[PDB]
């Protein structure tokens, strides 16, 4: 006799088995009018205008292929499709695979001059159907899918010389991509980077593999830890139109500016401006100085030249440059001008308009909020995402500013669905005629299509009504997004609150932390995660807090932990917990903390602080000492680990030094043994330190799991194990 | 009213006193008073300071050990000790003239020397350095380089590689001086095609990049090291020509395939015996090699070969036994399994195939301890048919039925486990009693076996112990299939059989193991019984040793079967004894014990609530070849692959859903690779089994660093207490 009251909760199995699924609407714009989508495994083509669709590629076309197809890529001219199979993951972005090209107008596979197995990367030219691929660390180009390839580079060498692909650090920390190949807009030129890792030390770890392997494998990866020798980089442009079968290809080198060549530096951004103009952004090893070169092709020479009067410098006196790297430029059509996000005089990131020949740029946006990204640029309008709306740093809306009058700024998403939608991202059609808006919260995700001419909504792509239907009688948690004031500054936090939240009660509280530089953990995003289960089923409040060092709020907050990681950011989580208890609905005896990666570091630093505030905590794949982490990320915030730079603080910010304070708390340390990112080493040293001072704690290694501990079975195992640990700690049955 | 606490165990509050002596002659031995080296006369009981602490104050290094040349004229001082594996280590050495009471500063033994030993007489010195053998005729003269093939991880001269060290010789050294020091026999090991186990060593926090340790280690069925044997005349060395080592080749019976050198024993000045063992360890051969005066060569008559083989298993307990030669070397005694499968002493004449057994019975000779012209002294478990007792016997060589027990009656209530150490010519012997009472060390004269005196009686420990509620020890047997199987129980103080106690089964259970005995111990179990009121039991089932081949060989080729089943059945019996809480039965073990613990927990028996496995083997293909193949044969379709694949803990993953499991393993375990637990953990994760875990960074198989040792026992205590609802 329940009278239809919601009696279900969001349980651990619901999360682990994905009972409640967020529907997505993932599309690929092929033109300015149409996009590809997946229905019941067939590749449909939709017409943005009307919404009429037809089948582009039936789900039976390749059922005789003989292998499982991981992904596909359609040539920009829509004449061929690249089929990806034998996918074998490497790091976060990299992987190898086999490829076959299917000709769409002959409905036939191409059996001649096939792309080799173990190919590291493949990319179509942006127009037409030329192919560039990397194999054995060398670059190859196919002008037509059925013709022999032209070998561009001959120096490729496993673990030493990389042409067209990155090494570990560049992939993970510099580019966020494996690809180091950049086609000119019309395909004439193929720009690439070459990395030399000759003297970069190798991290080595065991890989146990299937139980069949009698002897474990030692994995060895070139990986510069803080202060170690970094890979070097060279940049080249090759004219693909002048490739020859009788002569080797001529790659034209573009050298980094003299102000970079004086020392260690990085190539940090490549952006084509026009068919014959390419911009390159370089960053010094001490990451407070970057130079943007703008280089033009010379018809006579066949060379590329960068004019000093076109160099733009971007520096910082308070920290590093950019959120994680200097922003990318968005060039106007003629390539004589560009827009880009930079910190203004007050430390807020806003869009600056540069003329190619001029040092002084002018700001088209301003205010105490920040521009997240530039999404599209037309002749009349620039579209961007910002967190200006209602001054909520954790909110995201799409705006459009008239290039001819900066006072004319329109918000396109703010008011579409104000109660349901406050976190937007966008996907523009090939020439911005249309755009898809994706709102991730705080209500159920909603995907809509729009024409930009007069920004009316065309239709609802995905509204997650099915999920909405399932959730009706489930006691879901709510989210509170608000701020507290420390030293006259707003600091935002979020709390996942148990259903039927009652201020009169004292809830156990879990602090879910990340808190690295430019992080944001308090936002308007709707999530179905572990926190969802903890709040809904176990009545635990899960809070996150963005303190000093956090992003999207100006350099004053973000740069506060410069050269001093493991200080304010750690101190702030503690102060947040104190604040949370003073609110009156938190049980002081049951406050815990957990985090992954930087978050595991903070968790561990917090637990080893002697603050007495936290009963227990969980660190997953934590950094433990900055010298063990990679050079480009670490040194960005910590400078060099030398007596003449910042060695003292490197040594003062390790978790191992706080070992003794762990006697006051219950600690669960978790790490995957094949973590190529934060090495198991880091946790191995935390554990040895705890053992050395006689502190008891809980541990779990994950055989062959990497930084994401994302294998289906491992993912379920870790959240199960962490759930027991938290329940135990909080005396929950 | 205090109990024996975890801290007591961890901090060694109550220490067992020892009386470690080393004989120097037939009537004197050395002893170390905390601080001091004394010389004792065996006859009178009187000492004088032999080496005063202060002799080396000005040294400037910290001394690990010392070694007196047999003639008594020099003392080797060992320092800068750096442990390698179980027995192997590196160290620096200095030689001090005793009569001139000064350091030798000339032609010093190098730093990083791998092994050094004095000749059995005089003061010649042999050492191994950088995998090469060197000889020093006199402490202060250049050393002669015997071998030139030494090469790290590849060629080992005079020292063993990983597997020979751990599993064959139980020693780092592969050097054997003839009785009067004339000859230096040595083995050479070639590991060229032996695969390497690689694992990470994290080192001090200061190391930025972990180091990868790489060790030549043959896992089951892999390529093995090869071995060569050599003998060098140290009396005809030169300072001008290189020494010439005479090779003794293995017998043709061994040369037809993979084989091992398993025993080297000098019989006389010019006769050496070598035992060889086929890779399939059920066939071994003893060659007896004589020096040929006119040829400079060593010849082994095919007619003097002695074969020892087994039809039911491997040969020997862990390896063929060592022979004990009569003074003339034309005859010898060695322990072999008789026709009923019981290990007894057999008397061989060098020239004849058939030997005669001088002992017999349903009990076993543990070891031959000494032999004189008139008697053979040996240790056995004959006393009262108790396999876990040990007593010293002496057999009259002119009449084998004339057998005197020398220790059975010294103190029957307190002493039932003896070991012995005879003086250089058996004039005297020290008796070491290890239980069931407090260890008792006594000295005796072998002429009439009279007790000269009590060397250490542990009276101090006995007084301290009066204060603490100590647990007791019950040693008994149960009957399974008309056969006796022994078990022990450490029972809590004031034990009351009308009460239901939690029980922890402490298991090892490897082949020839013995966990039920009369030895007195102060260990983790003591604490659990005394403070936590937990019964900790151990059981010796099929596969266990010292009770004959029918029991020991029952697991031949079938590891992970009967020995596992018998631990479960034993637990079932214990619960039927009435004083066990059957909802609180746990099991734990280390190494082979971790394997059995895991196989038991993965058995679905439903008998055990929880368990702890420490450094367990998880699948036999991961373990070393010598130990593994000895019991399992080869992992190939034509041999025993099926059972190798059938006996893994990983295969029993799903059943772990019924128990609480704690898995612990040191990451620098060179013996049972961390790999073994990494595969267990992955298998449990794959079937969605939750369990507890703990890795120990940089710890090896003993997890024996002071802090790690304390930390593991503390962690395990919490787990068992949680499991048994003990706050
Ligand atoms: C340790 O064992 C090693 C391999 O079992 C052994 O190496 C082998 O040595 C021979 C002679 O130096 C090398 O080769 C020669 O003759 C054979 C014909 O039987 C040819 O195949 C070779 O080309 C060459 O002419 C082998 O190459 C070598 N095997 C290897 C290195 O794997 C060592 O000599 C042994 N060490 C000692 C001290 O005995
Ligand atoms: C990769 O980088 C290394 C330097 O880190 C280059 O090695 C130098 O090459 C020159 C010319 O042969 C040698 O004389 C030097 O000894 C090398 N330095 C070393 C090995 O440290 C190497 O040439 C580079 N390769 C490429 C293709 O750029
Ligand atoms: C793509 O861009 C290129 C560069 O702007 C265009 O072409 C000329 O570039 C080629 C390079 O091989 C030179 O050989 C020609 O000489 C260039 N121009 C002159 C005046 O000589 C090319 O036409 C563009 N393609 C498309 C389809 O627009
Ligand atoms: C063994 O090692 C020691 C220590 O390295 C050797 O001696 C040192 O040599 C340096 C000069 O190279 C001196 O400045 C040190 O003072 C020496 N240490 C000491 C304690 O004196 C020693 O000579 C080595 N060789 C042998 C055979 O032991
Ligand atoms: C004693 O034996 C060694 C090793 O066989 C001799 O030395 C090597 O001989 C080669 C030439 O055949 C030299 O190039 C090496 O430098 C020598 N050293 C080593 C460490 O192998 C040594 O000369 C021998 N000589 C005699 C004459 O018996
Ligand atoms: C030594 O052990 C081996 C293997 O356990 C015994 O051999 C047999 O092995 C051969 C070769 O692999 C097989 O073809 C036979 O089928 C096995 N069975 C039998 C009954 O022999 C060998 O007999 C043992 N030697 C001794 C002396 O017992
Ligand atoms: C949508 O209708 C137009 C009108 O003819 C047609 O050209 C187009 O092919 C249709 N869409 C698809 C996806 O085929
Ligand atoms: C790649 O591998 C497959 C199967 O291994 C083989 O049949 C094929 O011919 C190889 N080469 C290419 C280019 O796919
Ligand atoms: C291209 O370059 C490679 C290496 O530099 C060389 O071996 C090859 O001969 C060249 N090919 C031609 C056709 O010159
Ligand atoms: C870059 O950082 C270094 C070290 O903090 C400093 O010496 C230098 O002045 C910085 N550059 C700028 C422009 O602040
Ligand atoms: C100082 O101000 C910052 C914010 O600007 C605030 O987080 C902090 O708590 C104040 N406290 C300290 C401890 O310096
Ligand atoms: C900790 O910081 C102080 C300066 O506040 C520095 O002197 C000390 O050396 C640092 N710790 C380490 C381990 O260097
Ligand atoms: C031992 O005692 C005897 C007394 O008979 C004495 O002659 C001998 O030298 C003593 N020496 C030592 C070192 O005890
Ligand atoms: C040691 O034995 C050998 C027998 O060949 C002999 O030549 C040597 O001299 C012996 N020791 C002596 C006689 O002291
Ligand atoms: C019979 O064999 C042994 C003793 O010989 C015994 O331990 C075992 O439990 C009995 N039965 C079975 C089926 O193993
Ligand atoms: C495991 O053993 C059984 C028989 O005991 C056998 O049938 C099975 O095939 C064995 N393992 C393998 C890998 O074949
Ligand atoms: C050449 C072969 O191709 C097919 C597969 O069996 C393997 O990938 C191998 O490389």
UniProtKB/Swiss-Prot annotation, chain B:
Stored InterPro entries: AB_hydrolase_fold, Pept_S9_AS, Peptidase_S9_cat, Peptidase_S9B_N, Serine_Prot_S9B/DPPIV
Alphabetized GO MF terms: aminopeptidase activity; chemorepellent activity; dipeptidyl-peptidase activity; identical protein binding; protease binding; protein homodimerization activity; serine-type endopeptidase activity; serine-type peptidase activity
Entry GO terms, CC: apical plasma membrane; cell surface; endocytic vesicle; extracellular exosome; extracellular region; focal adhesion; intercellular canaliculus; lamellipodium
Key words, A-Z: Aminopeptidase, Cell adhesion, Cell junction, Cell membrane, Cell projection, Disulfide bond, Glycoprotein, Host-virus interaction, Hydrolase, Membrane, Protease, Receptor, Secreted, Serine protease, Signal-anchor, Transmembrane, Transmembrane helix
Reaction it catalyzes: Release of an N-terminal dipeptide, Xaa-Yaa-|-Zaa-, from a polypeptide, preferentially when Yaa is Pro, provided Zaa is neither Pro nor hydroxyproline
Regulation: Inhibited by GPC3 and diprotin A.
Post-translational modification: The soluble form (Dipeptidyl peptidase 4 soluble form also named SDPP) derives from the membrane form (Dipeptidyl peptidase 4 membrane form also named MDPP) by proteolytic processing. N- and O-Glycosylated.
Expressing tissues: Expressed specifically in lymphatic vessels but not in blood vessels in the skin, small intestine, esophagus, ovary, breast and prostate glands. Not detected in lymphatic vessels in the lung, kidney, uterus, liver and stomach (at protein level). Expressed in the poorly differentiated crypt cells of the small intestine as well as in the mature villous cells. Expressed at very low levels in the colon.
Active site: 591 (charge relay system), 669 (charge relay system), 701 (charge relay system)
Signal peptide interval: none
The family this protein is said to belong to: Belongs to the peptidase S9B family. DPPIV subfamily.
Described purpose of this protein according to its UniProt entry: Cell surface glycoprotein receptor involved in the costimulatory signal essential for T-cell receptor (TCR)-mediated T-cell activation. Acts as a positive regulator of T-cell coactivation, by binding at least ADA, CAV1, IGF2R, and PTPRC. Its binding to CAV1 and CARD11 induces T-cell proliferation and NF-kappa-B activation in a T-cell receptor/CD3-dependent manner. Its interaction with ADA also regulates lymphocyte-epithelial cell adhesion.
Subunit (UniProt): Monomer. Homodimer. Heterodimer with Seprase (FAP). Requires homodimerization for optimal dipeptidyl peptidase activity and T-cell costimulation. Found in a membrane raft complex, at least composed of BCL10, CARD11, DPP4 and IKBKB. Associates with collagen. Interacts with PTPRC; the interaction is enhanced in an interleukin-12-dependent manner in activated lymphocytes. Interacts (via extracellular domain) with ADA; does not inhibit its dipeptidyl peptidase activity. Interacts with CAV1 (via the N-terminus); the interaction is direct. (Microbial infection) Interacts with MERS coronavirus/MERS-CoV spike protein.
Record's protein name: Dipeptidyl peptidase 4
Organism, scientific name: Homo sapiens
């Amino acid at each position: 006799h329940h009278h239809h009251h919601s009696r279900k909760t969001y349980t651990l199995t619901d999360y682990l088995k994905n009972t409640y699924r967020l529907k997505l609407y993932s599309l690929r714009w092929i033109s300015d009018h149409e996009y590809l989508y997946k229905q019941e495994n067939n590749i449909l083509v939709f017409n943005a205008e009307y919404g009429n669709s037809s089948v582009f590629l039936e789900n039976s076309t390749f059922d005789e292929f003989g292998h499982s197809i991981n992904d596909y890529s359609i040539s920009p001219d829509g004449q061929f499709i690249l089929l990806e199979y034998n996918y074998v993951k490497q790091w976060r972005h990299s992987y190898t695979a086999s490829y076959d090209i299917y000709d769409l107008n002959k409905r036939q596979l191409i059996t001649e001059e096939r792309i080799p197995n173990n190919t590291q990367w493949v990319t179509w030219s942006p127009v037409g159907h030329k192919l560039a691929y990397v194999w054995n660390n060398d670059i190859y180009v196919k002008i037509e899918p059925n013709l022999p390839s032209y070998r561009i580079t001959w120096t490729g060498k496993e673990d030493i010389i990389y042409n067209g692909i990155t090494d570990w650090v560049y992939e993970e920390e510099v580019f966020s991509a494996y690809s180091a190949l950049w086609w000119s807009p019309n395909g004439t030129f193929l720009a690439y980077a070459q990395f030399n890792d000759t003297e970069v030390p190798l991290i080595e770890y065991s890989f146990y593999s299937d139980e069949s392997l009698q002897y474990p494998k030692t994995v060895r990866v070139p990986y510069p830890k803080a202060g170690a020798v970094n890979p070097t980089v060279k940049f080249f442009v090759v004219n693909t139109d002048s490739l020859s079968s009788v002569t080797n290809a001529t790659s034209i080198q573009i050298t980094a500016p003299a102000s970079m060549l004086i020392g260690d530096h990085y190539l940090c951004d490549v952006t084509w401006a026009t068919q014959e103009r390419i911009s390159l952004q370089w960053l010094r090893r001490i990451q407070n100085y970057s130079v943007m070169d703008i280089c033009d092709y010379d018809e006579s020479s066949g060379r590329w030249n960068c004019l000093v009067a076109r160099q733009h410098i971007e520096m910082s006196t308070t920290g590093w440059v950019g959120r994680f790297r200097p922003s990318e430029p968005h060039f106007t059509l003629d390539g004589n001008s560009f827009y880009k996000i930079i910190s203004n005089e007050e430390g807020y990131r806003h869009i600056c308009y540069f003329q190619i020949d001029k040092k002084d740029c002018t700001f088209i946006t301003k205010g105490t909020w920040e521009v997240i990204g530039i999404e599209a640029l037309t002749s009349d309008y620039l579209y961007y995402i910002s967190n200006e709306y209602k001054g909520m740093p954790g909110g995201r809306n799409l705006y459009k500013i008239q290039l001819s009058d900066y006072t004319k700024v329109t918000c396109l998403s703010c008011e579409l669905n104000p109660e349901r939608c406050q976190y937007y991202s966008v996907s523009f059609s090939k020439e911005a005629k249309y755009y898809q808006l994706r709102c991730s919260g705080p209500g159920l995700p909603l995907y809509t299509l729009h024409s930009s001419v007069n920004d009316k909504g065309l239709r609802v792509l995905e509204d997650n009504s099915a999920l909405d239907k399932m959730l009706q009688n489930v006691q879901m948690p709510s989210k509170k997004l608000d701020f507290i004031i420390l030293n006259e500054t707003k600091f935002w936090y979020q709390m996942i609150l148990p259903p039927h939240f009652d201020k009169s009660k004292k809830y156990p509280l879990l602090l879910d932390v990340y808190a690295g530089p430019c992080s944001q953990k308090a936002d308007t995003v709707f999530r179905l995660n572990w926190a969802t289960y903890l709040a809904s089923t176990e009545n635990i409040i899960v809070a996150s807090f963005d303190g000093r060092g956090s992003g999207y709020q100006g350099d004053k907050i973000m740069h506060a932990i410069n050269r001093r990681l493991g200080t304010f950011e750690v101190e702030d989580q503690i102060e947040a917990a104190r604040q949370f208890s003073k609110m009156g609905f938190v049980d002081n005896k049951r406050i815990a903390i957990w985090g992954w990666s930087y978050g595991g570091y903070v968790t561990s630093m917090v637990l080893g602080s002697g603050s007495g505030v936290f009963k227990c905590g969980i660190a997953v794949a934590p950094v433990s000492r900055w010298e063990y982490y990679d050079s480009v990320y670490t040194e960005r915030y910590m400078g060099l680990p030398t007596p003449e730079d910042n060695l003292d603080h490197y040594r003062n910010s390790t978790v191992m030094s706080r070992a003794e304070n762990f006697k006051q708390v219950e600690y669960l340390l978790i790490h995957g043994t094949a973590d190529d990112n934060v090495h198991f080493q880091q946790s191995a040293q935390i554990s040895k330190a705890l053992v050395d001072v006689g502190v008891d704690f809980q541990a779990m290694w994950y055989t062959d799991e990497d930084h994401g501990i994302a294998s289906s079975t491992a993912h379920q195992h870790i959240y199960t194990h962490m759930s027991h640990f938290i329940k135990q700690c909080f005396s929950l049955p």
